């Protein structure tokens, strides 16, 4: 049986790396704007069931359903080029433009103000789905419909289907501007408590260090949405190509998330990508992975915190010899060019796969790192400071209490305070050779 | 070729409006409790028939003369010009009257059970009900032995005969693809020894059919006995397809050391049409209860 | 454990799953089929399917000439 | 054996599907306007022979307005028609939409109609029944039209009874505020008087267009082709002699296992433009059935009732063209096994499949193409609609006045009422089906 995976793209951001993701998705396998499929494409070996659906006349639509409490961005995907690939009856849009207003509690409740119909939406697509494995929600946790409505869909998420996974490619903010949203830690703390609680896995997409890549390896001064969301594009692409290429092993998801996930709370995984370069050996490729100028996700590397890898999943695509993959593994295991958690054997695997046919790619070889590091734990702790930060001052909390997650009381905040200390706590014990007896 | 083809409308019925006006008369004759068996009958409708459309083979084509037992006596005379005839020898000419007989006694279930109306019985309500589950279950049934002969045997057999004469370049190779399409018409009509208990099976479905439409006919009035004895026939006739079908799989069993593909495929046809034929004449067995 | 009919409803269900995987074009799936290696086939039986399943190629002209039997059983092993 | 079958082309929808149809045809066989054989196809099924070879549609078209006998008169196939068969009311008012001033008007036209279907009778070798072509919303072919089914199923009760009828688009605001009225009575009439109904939604039919044939906006005259689609794959199998399903008797009792279960879903293939030429791709029947499987390519709007677990009760595909038979054998085994279709509770999947050729006067550029017929317990959904359509009328008395005046509701409306009652039995009985209690 296939393994379906609906792609739920939450509010303006989670609807524009969609559609992006989408639209790569058609350029990687040949499918026209229109979902018909390109002329070039017909003897491809990839395996679309798996993300996409086929309509009964060869047509691909993509297993996406795009949610948003305002009409301009749902419009703009109507309106796009791309419009026909979308089954327009799995798109349910709120037609109360006025949003969540980046509240977590106001994206909840409006959730559970449109939770017949989302739902009604997600049975339908399941039931077309003959092994419907699982969800990933593109959306932030910081803002209104990805934090509020993804943590009202994540609970109902939760009680409807409790045996299909729940995977988040979760975009954080940028950390180093001032949110215009002074509540937007409160939004991104209730959003990782119900990640903590209703989440199998959070992918964290760090917004800032997106831009800092912009700039100091791509070039980009002032990086728009855009060029982060056609990196993201990349990122999906490469998560995606173990799915689009059909290989010899590791060809579900539970396998990838039982190698990558070993902690179900200590479920946050960092990403890597290779290249990264505006416009070769195996073991070259990983080394230039393994570089930190190249990761692409903002965790400090804390010098008294001895922060490690705990696994590592490089996925390398096209012509690879697998005799320099061998010698690679062995050259980077000699030089200890990466450390790894104490408490547990490395995990670090070389996928080989083959590039789609349809896209064609300038670079012969591209890699893609996936990473579980304890420096994430600088990420949390940052975030629970922020929180911290945020809550100690009682600002803009009128609006809060006006809302009924936060009328009574702050305890959701408390709560989200403590299970974000717990989450860094868990680092910290991974951090430490009896995490193994932790 | 034009011989062949002639002998493909008339003795397998390829002819099919042709067999259809024959099988109607024939079925319209046999409900009227009509002598059909009269040859002057038969033969005035055959040459009638053949003589609208088919001068040449109208010369050719002769009617001689358990329900589906009734039309047992029906003879087809096809006349062969010469030389051909020294080829389509007297055996060869029986041969195809015998795959003509098989035909229209399956076209004649055909008929009798598609000109049946619902108002016939109608105008003739649990009981009526029970009919009409019966009705459907012997439709069901009908409808995929119709298909899987006409496509499985008869399709598939004129298809093969077609190219195998085609490619003929010896009057031995065209005699060999002419027995070959016999023999593959002739396994699929169950005529082999080797399938008599499968032959025996269907022809009991089919007689519990045509005791089910003469039911159908004789309307509500009969229908608290026919409830019963349609139903007491369908659960016999599920229990014989079930029994056929686990007999296929001790077949199956007993052949994977002896090929045959065929066997094998009627029976894959026979699996989804015996077990419809199970359930829907278990339709008409849960009314008399 | 292996029935007389697991080889047939295996081969059924291997081009059940060829159709779910959209593999319905290959004509080498019926060229291929699952076969069972079972001690009921003669009228110790494998415990379960598992332990039962083979696999049959089915090589073609002039191919046989490559595709030895030994070299069938060592692509069963 | 020949079965002559006399087609009646009722009104305005009727008349204009009765032209289209006959155009079709004369191109599909290479017919000239006048009848003529243009320079081995059964005529004489739809068509009468006249003595000087000239081919004449056993077609009856009554309109109760001149406008569109005017029409069909100044039409290329106005010589196709023998124009002594054509009775037309000189009242050219119609029925207005309203059941009961059409049933009303057959009666005051009964004669004239009834020598017309007698002459067309009689013109028949062995007539069948007559197939009526007309909408259950419009005035002639709901009223007028069950006016000639009562007087047709009284005068050959052993005729069957065939309509196609055009039902008005549940989705759009009918511009007669009485039609849920008309619809109830010829409902009534079709389900007393008529053999089988198949209703032919204009909404679903522009949705299909639309979404299969690449159609934006489907006009009338593209929808009336469709018709004509339908009616050349209805007569398929009396122009092109094949192994399966050759008389109309037989698709009937293939199609109505259930003498109350009578109404027909229709499927049709291919719904396509010309211009899609598919990419030399041997199209399978597998291929081909799983192409017409899809909802988007359904002419018919059956709602999805989360009610009611609407199932198929049985599908017919009849396949014109070059078909592979253990590709037939093996698109039905996809389909069954794939599980692509609910079928009817009470009974086993009934999955039929004719094989027919295709006319060899008509260009196919489709070396095969299909019209499925299926009965499908979400059909009942588009009956409850038409039903909640009916309720919403009566509940409001809206439009009744005209109905008062009539005959038919003139001193009660008990015939609206039974025939929403009868559409609720219907409706609940589809669902039975798809539920363990339809006995």
Redesign the interface.
Same mark, same amino acid.
């Given at each position: 049986m296939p393994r379906e995976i609906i792609t739920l793209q939450l509010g303006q951001c989670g609807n524009q790396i969609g559609f992006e993701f989408w639209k790569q998705l058609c350029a990687e396998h040949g499918i026209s704007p229109e979902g018909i499929v390109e002329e070039f494409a017909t003897e491809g070996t990839d395996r679309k069931d798996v993300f996409f659906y086929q309509a009964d006349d060869e047509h691909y639509i993509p297993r996406a359903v795009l949610l948003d409490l305002e009409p301009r961005v749902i419009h703009s995907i109507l309106n796009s080029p791309y419009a026909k690939l979308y089954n327009p009856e799995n798109i349910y849009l709120s037609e109360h433009g006025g949003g969540a207003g980046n509240n977590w509690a106001s994206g909840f409740s409006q959730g559970e103000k449109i939770h017949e119909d989302i739902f009604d939406i997600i049975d339908r697509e399941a039931d077309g789905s003959d092994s419907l494995e699982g969800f990933v929600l593109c959306h932030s946790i910081a803002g209104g419909t990805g934090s509020g409505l993804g943590s009202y869909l994540l609970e109902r998420l939760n009680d409807r289907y409790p045996k299909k996974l729940v995977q988040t490619y979760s975009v954080f903010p940028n950390q180093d501007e001032m949110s215009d949203v002074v509540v937007q830690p409160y939004n991104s703390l209730l959003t990782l408590k119900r990640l903590t609680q209703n989440a199998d896995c959070v992918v964290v997409l760090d917004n800032t260090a997106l831009n800092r890549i912009a700039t100091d390896r791509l070039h980009i001064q002032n990086p728009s949405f855009s060029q982060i969301n056609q990196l993201v594009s990349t990122i999906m692409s490469a998560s995606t190509t173990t799915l689009r290429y059909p290989g010899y092993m590791n060809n579900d998801l539970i396998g990838l998330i039982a190698s990558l996930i070993p902690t179900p709370r200590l479920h946050f995984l960092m990403t890597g990508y290779t290249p990264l370069t505006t416009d070769t050996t195996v073991l070259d490729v990983m080394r230039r992975l393994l570089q930190p100028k190249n990761v692409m996700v903002s965790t400090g590397r804390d010098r008294q915190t001895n922060h490690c890898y705990i696994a590592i999943l490089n996925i390398i695509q096209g012509e690879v010899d697998p005799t320099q993959v061998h010698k690679s593994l062995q050259r980077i295991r000699e030089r200890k060019l990466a450390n790894f958690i104490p408490w547990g054997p490395a995990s670090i695997q070389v996928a080989l796969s083959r590039k789609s046919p349809y896209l064609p790619s300038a670079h012969r070889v591209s890699g893609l790192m996936m990473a579980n590091h304890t420096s994430i734990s600088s990420l949390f702790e940052s975030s629970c400071q922020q929180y911290d930060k945020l809550r100690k001052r009682e600002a803009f909390l009128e609006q809060f209490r006006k809302e009924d997650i936060f009328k009574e009381n702050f305890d959701e905040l408390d709560r989200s305070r403590e299970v974000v200390q717990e989450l860094i706590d868990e680092y910290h014990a991974a951090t430490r050779p009896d995490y193994i007896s932790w | 070729v034009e011989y062949l083809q002639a002998m493909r409308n008339f003795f397998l019925m390829? =002819? =099919? *409006?042709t067999m259809? *006006?024959f099988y109607?008369?024939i079925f319209d004759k046999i409900r009227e409790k009509e002598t059909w068996q009269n040859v002057s009958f038969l033969n005035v409708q055959l040459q009638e028939a053949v003589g609208q459309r088919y001068p040449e083979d109208s010369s050719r084509l002769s009617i001689s003369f358990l329900p589906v037992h009734t039309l047992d006596g029906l003879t087809l005379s096809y006349k062969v010009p010469w030389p051909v005839d020294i080829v389509i020898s007297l055996e060869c000419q029986k041969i195809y009257n015998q795959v003509f007989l098989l035909l229209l006694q399956i076209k004649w279930a055909?008929?009798s059970? *598609? #000109?049946?109306? $619902? =108002?016939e019985l109608?105008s003739s309500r649990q009981q009526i !009900?029970r009919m $009409?589950?019966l009705? #459907?279950?012997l %439709?069901?049934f009908v /409808?995929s032995l !119709? /298909?899987y002969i %006409?496509?499985?045997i008869? !399709?598939?057999t004129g298809?093969e005969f077609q190219h195998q004469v085609e490619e003929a370049k010896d009057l031995d190779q065209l005699i060999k693809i002419h027995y070959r399409y016999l023999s593959t018409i002739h396994d699929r009509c169950l005529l082999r020894e080797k399938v008599s208990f499968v032959k025996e099976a269907i022809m009991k479905v089919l007689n519990l059919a045509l005791m089910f439409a003469d039911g159908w006919q004789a309307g509500l009035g009969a229908w608290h006995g026919i409830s019963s004895a349609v139903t007491h026939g369908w659960h016999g006739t599920k229990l014989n397809i079930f029994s056929a079908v686990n007999t296929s *799989?001790l077949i #199956?069993?007993?052949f !994977?050391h002896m090929q045959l593909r065929n066997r094998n495929l009627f029976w894959t #046809?026979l699996k989804?049409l015996v077990?419809?034929l199970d359930?829907?004449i278990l $339709?008409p067995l849960g009314?008399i209860g | 454990p292996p029935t007389a009919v697991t080889e047939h409803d295996v081969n059924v269900a291997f081009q059940q799953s060829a159709h779910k995987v959209l593999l319905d074009d290959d004509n080498l799936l019926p060229l291929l089929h699952l076969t069972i290696e079972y001690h009921g086939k003669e009228h110790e039986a494998p415990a379960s399917g598992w332990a039962a399943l083979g696999l049959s190629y089915k090589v073609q002209w002039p191919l046989h000439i490559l595709f030895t039997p030994a070299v069938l059983e060592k692509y069963n092993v």
């Open positions: - | 390829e =002819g =099919g *409006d259809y *006006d109607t008369s055909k008929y059970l *598609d #000109v049946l109306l $619902f =108002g109608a !009900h $009409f589950l009705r #459907v279950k %439709m069901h /409808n !119709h /298909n %006409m496509t499985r008869l !399709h598939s298809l *799989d #199956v069993i007993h !994977h #046809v989804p077990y419809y359930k829907w $339709f009314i | -």
